């Protein structure tokens, strides 16, 4: 196969990284592994270090003249690449050994473990009203050579590379997502009973969703309109709990449910980005540099609920709103996930 590479502007420092996309198995994540190439006489007294910093970065990095990132650091780690340290953790890996064989003596192994309590690559969509890129949690691997950890940063020394942490669907489907609502009235014994059921609890992007909705209007009021929409909730946690809920796809039908009657139907709704290019606050999956992508992949939580809230959390929900005449509006809400399948 191949190995992605990045080199310092000076050309004396180069870092080889085994992979660009890292995945988790809900119990352990594939370790970050790579090698760094450098010729010893360039430093001859300095030391080589690598850093994996995850930041709540705002804006962009192309020297934009605007209020730049609130650069809250979520989690940072360090490792002495050179001079060599004790062998752990634990040996050089198969890719590490292969790169050492390919290059020789000027390669240096560095290892990293991503804690399970970390967010997933998410990026908010930049609004046309503002300028440049927008905020969003992101990973970054930075290898620098210097005498001390706190020594001043140098462009020729530091090399910057971006990685992503994304999740993949478990092969075990979950319970059927369904809900019900029985709405009585202020005094009358007549009521309003409705049913909602879903095809599945897991879906792939672009794949249409068929909601099964049924109404039992054994009452006297009139149903004017039926509103069907899919809502997105984005739990943002920096030091305070917050969420910017926003709809993404809405479909309507001018269907009238008569009193003392029952009505059921199947509706098709699809979450897609083509019609929501401008809505600020939409959540997109992590980009490499600036390339487009799908909507934000739903992030499943671990079995142990712990806290797990140290970044951006995204979830999807579908709500169907029944417009009943002269008041009594009632809606039904239901959760589901939406994210990629397991590749090969």
């Amino acid at each position: 196969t191949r190995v992605f590479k990045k080199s310092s502007p000076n050309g004396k420092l180069t870092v080889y990284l085994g992979k660009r996309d890292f995945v988790d198995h809900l119990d352990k994540v594939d370790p970050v592994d790579g090698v760094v190439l450098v010729d010893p006489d360039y430093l001859k007294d300095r030391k080589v270090f690598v850093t994996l910093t995850v930041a709540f970065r705002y804006g962009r990095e192309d020297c934009d003249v605007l209020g730049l990132s609130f650069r809250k650091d979520l989690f940072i780690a360090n490792y002495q690449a050179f001079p060599p340290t004790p062998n752990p953790p634990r040996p050089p890996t198969r890719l590490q050994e292969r790169l050492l064989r390919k290059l020789g003596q000027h390669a240096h192994p560095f290892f990293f473990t991503i804690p399970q309590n970390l967010p997933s690559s998410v990026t908010l969509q930049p609004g046309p009203e503002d300028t440049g890129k927008a905020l969003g949690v992101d990973f970054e691997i930075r290898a620098f050579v210097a005498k001390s950890l706190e020594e001043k940063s140098h462009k020729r020394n530091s090399v910057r590379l971006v990685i992503r942490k994304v999740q993949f669907a478990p092969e075990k489907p979950g319970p059927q997502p369904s809900a019900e609502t029985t709405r009585h009235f202020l005094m009358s014994d007549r009521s309003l009973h409705l049913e909602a059921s879903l095809d599945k609890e897991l879906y792939y992007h672009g794949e249409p969703l068929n909601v099964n909705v049924h109404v039992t209007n054994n009452s006297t009021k009139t149903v004017k309109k039926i509103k069907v929409s899919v809502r997105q909730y984005a739990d943002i946690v920096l030091f305070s709990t917050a969420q910017y809920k926003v709809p993404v796809a809405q479909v309507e039908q001018d269907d009238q449910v008569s009193p003392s009657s029952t009505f059921s139907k199947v509706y098709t709704i699809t979450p897609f980005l083509a019609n929501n290019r401008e809505k600020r606050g939409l959540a997109l999956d992590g980009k490499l540099k600036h390339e487009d992508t799908n909507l934000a992949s739903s992030t499943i939580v671990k079995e142990g609920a712990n806290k797990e809230v140290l970044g951006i959390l995204v979830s999807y929900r579908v709500k169907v709103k029944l417009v009943v005449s002269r008041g009594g509006d009632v809606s039904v809400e239901l959760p589901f996930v939406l994210m990629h399948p397991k590749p090969h």
């Binding site: 191949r2 992605f4 590479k5 990045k6 080889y16 292969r98 064989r101 390919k102």
Partner: peptide
């Protein structure tokens, strides 16, 4: 820039 290199099959 980001590029690729070689790697050999062991």
């Amino acid at each position: 820039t980001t590029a690729s290199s070689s790697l050999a099959k062991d």
